[PDB]
Amino acid sequence: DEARRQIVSNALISEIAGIVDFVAEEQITVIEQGIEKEITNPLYEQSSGIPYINRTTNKDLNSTMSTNASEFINWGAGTSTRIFFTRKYCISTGTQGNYEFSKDYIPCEEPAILSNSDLKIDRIDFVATDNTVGSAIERVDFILTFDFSNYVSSLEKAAEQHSISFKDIYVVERNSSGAAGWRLTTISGKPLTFSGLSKNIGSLDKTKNYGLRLSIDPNLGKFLRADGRVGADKLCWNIDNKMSGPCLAADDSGNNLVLTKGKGAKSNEPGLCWDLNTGTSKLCLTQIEGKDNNDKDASLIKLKDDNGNPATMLANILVEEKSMTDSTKKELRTIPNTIYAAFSNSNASDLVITNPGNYIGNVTSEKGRIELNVQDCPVSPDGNKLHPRLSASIASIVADTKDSNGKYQADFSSLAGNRNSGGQLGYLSGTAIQVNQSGSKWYITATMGVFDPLTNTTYVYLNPKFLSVNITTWCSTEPQ
Amino acid sequence: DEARRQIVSNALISEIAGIVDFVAEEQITVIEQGIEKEITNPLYEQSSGIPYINRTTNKDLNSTMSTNASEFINWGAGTSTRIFFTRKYCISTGTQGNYEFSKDYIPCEEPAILSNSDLKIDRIDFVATDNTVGSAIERVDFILTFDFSNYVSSLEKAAEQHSISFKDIYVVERNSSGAAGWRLTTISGKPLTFSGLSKNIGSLDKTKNYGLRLSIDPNLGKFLRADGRVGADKLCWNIDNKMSGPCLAADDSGNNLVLTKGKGAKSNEPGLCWDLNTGTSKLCLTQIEGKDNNDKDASLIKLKDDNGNPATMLANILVEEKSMTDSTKKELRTIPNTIYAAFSNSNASDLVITNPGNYIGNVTSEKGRIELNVQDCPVSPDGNKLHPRLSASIASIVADTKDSNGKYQADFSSLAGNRNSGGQLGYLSGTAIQVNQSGSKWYITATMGVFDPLTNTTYVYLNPKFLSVNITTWCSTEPQ
């Protein structure tokens, strides 16, 4: 069953991956007296003790594996090794380890799947690059005891998923069950690598106890990697085979990437550009020189094509400014919309309000009204509730009266033709324009006073086709 | 003093780093009669002379160091060597060197500290990769004469701070004070590395003149480097272990990075995205197809979530367009704000202007006025002074008169209740609305004419509560 093998290999590679992470940190983030502190990894202090200083020297993958217990590191059951690679306070009391890492490299308790599995990490070798105490480790070999190509496929899959790869896989053997008895399995004096285990499986006696030695190369080499595990101090782009293009580097915050000019730029105007490569100009977001409201030196961003003409961005925009009434307070608003509209009462029955002093209206159901759906306000920063807003301004207004047939002729329903219907005008008293809202609708209503000097009769009109307004809608922190 | 040793090492590494940087440039930017031009490094012209063609042949770090003066390069006092690695016009008249580099690899005048320090660069070896004239150099060795573990610590610190690392450090000796007498210090026929000077210090006689040979490798090509000293032609990202993601490359300008679609994209809509990983959609700035005002093919940018809906950007926006009056001139504007407000004179004492023909207002101090703080305008590109603007449009107006109690009933202070007090209206003459400013304030005032037909009395009102306006505020290059 390979589904069980896959769990064992995922745990094994999880353990292997954590250990490599620990080796690959020369400075580790530790927790001394409640405040994170960076200290040198105990691996590279020539003052730390067993097992942090333990080193083997078989730099060659084909050299004889060590038989010294203070050179390799015995792992697993019966060993207190795990204490030295887990937090001091994996128990509430504190273990015998002296370090509280800011992060768990491996779980404090070994994965339960590995407690009785057929493949276990039995011993870990730290290959030293030189002969100084606390030297750098240039290869980590993991001896996994078998309690053979099925697991290698499974382990290779699990390592593929964890962004690690084996330098090589060797078959290792020992005559007993001691951690220092491990030697390389040999075919004619040549150590048997796993890739060559297909042809040499027959010349191996069942009298030995076998396992695999997985060799990794911890050092996260100074070069940027496909797995992205290299932090870049900066990165610059080439132009015509020279390092004269823009550069990206992080600022101190950890949140921001900063784009700066290259050495080849004759002008200092860095930009990010999008290109469809479909025959039109790329669009660039470029930083350019400016001046503030007090004529001091400043800068801004411009979205432009390759001709220097502004480009178009589709988005919701919020603008923040101090309230022009009370300063020291911020106000947010969106880009407004304008709709031209006139009211729609046309005949005398709907137009004339019979008893003005007594009339009590219902702007939700009055004839001739303007009705709109309440817009949805866009995203706003935390703690700034945006309210939908609406207002109306007078666009055209006349005091039209009944003609010889009791009909009203002045009509402003279409802006391109307001003067083409003239009407028979009286004296204007003015108009009262009101804006109300329910949960879903904006309601706009109006009242106009007119004196007819022909009949000396006073009329009050409701939502007339003689009055048209320009309606402005937006969202704002300033309520309605 | 490790403080004095550190300055010597910083100078030493500065020289070393500059020299190595020059070695690492096969094409160099030179200046020929006013203009920068690319020419082949004289090191790799089989037509250049001493010392550009000088090459040693000890490829092995353990091989015999050359003893031929036309193979190694003597450095320092008594040598004209430095001329050939600095600009021709480090002096105003011109030196015997033949090249004006566009940049100083090493300072023209040697760091003054190196003129008399205990450690000096005595000789520089250019290890050739083959036996052709002007061949590539595969290692640069700096022989430093002592005029031994203290300075190695300092030099390694200085090389760490200057983004270089030593391939290896050897101990060298000479029987006298010639630059060609340098040979490798040996213990039992084995060249003495510095990592083995701890155990063999006693078997070294003080009758020799000793020094260190620092070996630096030349290029850091092909692979991008963590310290960012390697430029990228482009960079593309992986998806599912394939190079199918977007690509960034510099355009010709030196200012722009250009984002383009990946090979795995089924649509051509490249985007830059932000993600908080806090449960909401990432926000993307994506380039999409569009059409201009002549319906010709074009493009724009869209700020959208993963659902294709517009997202919100909080920023100040400037829009540029040609003046709708005088073409050939460009004008800037900001996103406006709208304020609904009514004037506030309510009682007859404040409302009525007794002798209108004689009245001279003081719009700064008149009762009932609308007063606002002059807004601050945002940043604009150089040479485009923005002026604050304010305008008013009529929202509601009626020709109210005194009621039976001498009070004025119509009130438009609240848009949602403009019709709630009808008042007793006369005939309207109109209104004059004025906007003025001091250094800090907008002053909005108004005058309304009303004829009362009940009393045949002519009225002029100042800043009445029955007149309301929509105040629009913005910034523009078009003045007030």
Partner: peptide, 11 residues
């Protein structure tokens, strides 16, 4: 909600 008219005068 509510909307109302207004009284006007006669000579």
């Amino acid at each position: 909600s509510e909307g109302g008219a207004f009284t006007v005068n006669m000579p």
